Design a protein around this ligand. Structure first.
Ligand SMILES: *[C@@H]1O[C@H](CO)[C@@H](O[C@@H]2O[C@H](CO)[C@@H](O)[C@H](O)[C@H]2NC(C)=O)[C@H](O)[C@H]1NC(C)=O
Ligand SMILES: *[C@@H]1O[C@H](CO)[C@@H](O)[C@H](O)[C@H]1NC(C)=O
Ligand SMILES: [Ca+2]
Ligand SMILES: [Ca+2]
Lengths: 129, 216, 120, 112
């Protein structure tokens, strides 16, 4: 209740919260706190959509490209309504999987000579077809 | 002073765009009051029910055949007030229309929704009208609360919680994914009254669509 | 389950097991592969399903595949594919190698740059 | 005003602002010196006096000097000397640097 969520990334599992604590009583001596929580996977591979990819042992977390806003907002100017660009900075790699997303693959299946490629489910359960 | 019987917005594409035409007693004329802010345009749009005012401007008169006379009173309206009847007007007098310019107003297309692909309606894929195009709604966040809001608007009764076993009978879509991350908390009256991301921005695929089955 | 630690020391061969449990009825189809290449019907074996003593109505079976010690030490990948009616997409697959599954050590590197950037 | 951090992040230059208000009458002269050596007049742009709408009778202006990113990072110092008749010694100075700020802390936790 006393914390405000800024970003809730799922691919990098990054979550940032900010909070002001009323330390002492002088209004000019209150500290501003920034919390970062990162969960890293140790079993996932380089490309989450290809099981043959090698393992990944290097993780990079840029905070300038995480707390960024990229959706035009509406602004009232007393004579019209316009769309405004939040940031000008606006291929990112997905470290972990997303529950709200489904991951599938193509695999050759041989039986009596004939080969039937069928869609698989890399994720354990995720969504249903 | 005359009381406006209605507005018609003639000489424009459809009836949500054109020139402001106040209905004077008997014969009606065009109005070019000064200080025409968006607040008066909002009341004008609400008169017709088109939707939200988006733009208002005065255009140069280059042989536009402005035969319609001009009014002789102002219509200072707070915008949040009611129909043109309930907003103060000056006591007749002279006109503020010095430069001969017509007043323009641009309302928006009204909202609509339907279910496509289900038998006898009340079931199927969700399509929402906006900008004169129908499109699909993403299922990234589709709780049970977001299901009942659509059902009562079309009068299909309370949803019976059909799960996803029978949601494969409608298939995917081909239209643009207009809405995403829809979160409806209360009943409200319409889906647009909820909190969404934006019109045209999504991170979904036509495979992941929303299927709603009400009681019928 | 990856091959046992004390089996690789003899440097003869390695055995990988694919355990599938908790299903009904008792008709399953397990096929092994190596980095997208279907393997021969002769290198792996499978057993008929048998009842589970703990929970009645759910069965289990397993498939055993053998591989050369040098081939497994190189770092090749293997996949287990099972076909049954109960699955949503009706086929699932899982992948194991040397680096994943009872490993020796864990090497991780982390970089956190632009920690004082603009958030707004 | 210390330079914007995002401007430095993008790595072109930096913006130093010298905001001076609350003087009367309208007579002010600001200069830019580095390490005790005044800089050329072609290094900063000087604004002009203009009344403050809130408090009548007060004027204010400012001056901005652009510095190279490497020069700002190397630790060079800058200052904005001001001259006004009403001042006691007719000279007042404010000085900032990269190190100008409040010491921060890092409560890093690693859960193996
Ligand atoms: C990670 O894996 C995916 C899936 O194999 C790669 O993208 C696929 O590329 C093939 C052709 O090589 C297409 O048939 C698929 O449609 C692609 N997938 C999707 C979802 O479009 C992707 O290129 C791989 N990334 C890297 C860096 O190798
Ligand atoms: C360090 O973490 C503890 C909780 O583990 C917290 O009480 C404390 O405030 C943190 N230190 C700082 C400087 O925020
Ligand atoms: Ca989804
Ligand atoms: Ca989304």
């Amino acid at each position: 209740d006393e914390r405000i969520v800024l970003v809730d990334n799922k691919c990098k599992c990054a979550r940032i919260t900010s909070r002001i604590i009323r330390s002492s009583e002088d209004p000019n001596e209150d500290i501003v706190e920034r919390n970062i929580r990162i969960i890293v996977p140790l079993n996932n591979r380089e490309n989450i959509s290809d099981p043959t990819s090698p393992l990944r042992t290097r993780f990079v977390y840029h905070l300038s490209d995480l707390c960024k806003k990229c959706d035009p907002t509406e602004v009232e100017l007393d004579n019209q309504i316009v769309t405004a660009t939040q940031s000008n900075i606006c291929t990112e790699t997905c470290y972990t999987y997303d529950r709200n997303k489904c991951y599938t693959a193509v695999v050759p299946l041989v039986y009596g000579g004939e080969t039937k490629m069928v869609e698989t489910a890399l994720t354990p359960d995720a969504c249903y077809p | 002073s005359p009381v406006p019987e209605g507005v018609r917005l003639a000489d424009g594409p459809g009836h949500c765009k054109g020139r402001v035409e106040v209905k004077h007693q008997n014969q009606w004329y065009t109005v070019c009051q000064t200080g025409w802010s968006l607040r008066a345009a909002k009341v004008v749009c609400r008169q017709l029910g088109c939707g939200r005012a988006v733009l208002t401007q005065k255009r140069c008169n280059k042989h536009a055949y402005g035969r319609k006379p001009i009014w002789l009173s102002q219509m200072s309206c707070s915008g949040r007030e009611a129909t043109l009847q309930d907003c103060p007007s000056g006591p007749w007098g002279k006109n503020t229309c010095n430069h001969d310019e017509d007043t323009w107003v641009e309302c928006e297309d009204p909202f609509d929704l339907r279910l496509v692909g289900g038998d006898n309606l009340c079931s199927g894929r969700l399509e929402v009208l906006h900008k004169g195009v129908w499109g699909s709604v993403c299922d990234d966040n589709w709780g049970e609360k977001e299901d009942q809001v659509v059902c009562k608007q079309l009068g299909c009764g309370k949803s019976l919680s059909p799960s996803f076993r029978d949601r494969k009978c409608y298939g995917p879509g081909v239209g643009r994914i207009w809405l995403d991350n829809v979160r409806c908390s209360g009943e409200e009256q319409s889906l647009e009254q909820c909190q969404h991301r934006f019109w045209g921005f999504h991170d979904c695929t036509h495979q992941e669509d929303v299927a709603v089955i009400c009681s019928g | 389950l990856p091959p046992a630690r004390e089996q690789l020391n003899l440097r003869e061969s390695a055995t990988i097991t694919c355990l599938v449990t908790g299903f009904s009825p008792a008709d399953v189809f397990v096929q092994w592969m190596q980095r997208g290449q279907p393997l021969s019907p002769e290198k792996y074996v499978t057993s008929a399903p048998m009842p589970e003593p703990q929970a009645p109505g759910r069965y289990f079976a397993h498939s055993i595949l053998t591989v050369s010690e040098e081939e497994w030490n190189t770092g090749e990948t293997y996949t287990c594919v099972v076909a049954h009616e109960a699955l949503p997409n009706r086929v699932t697959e899982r992948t194991v190698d040397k680096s994943t599954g009872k490993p020796t050590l864990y090497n991780v590197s982390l970089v956190m740059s632009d920690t004082a950037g603009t958030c707004y």
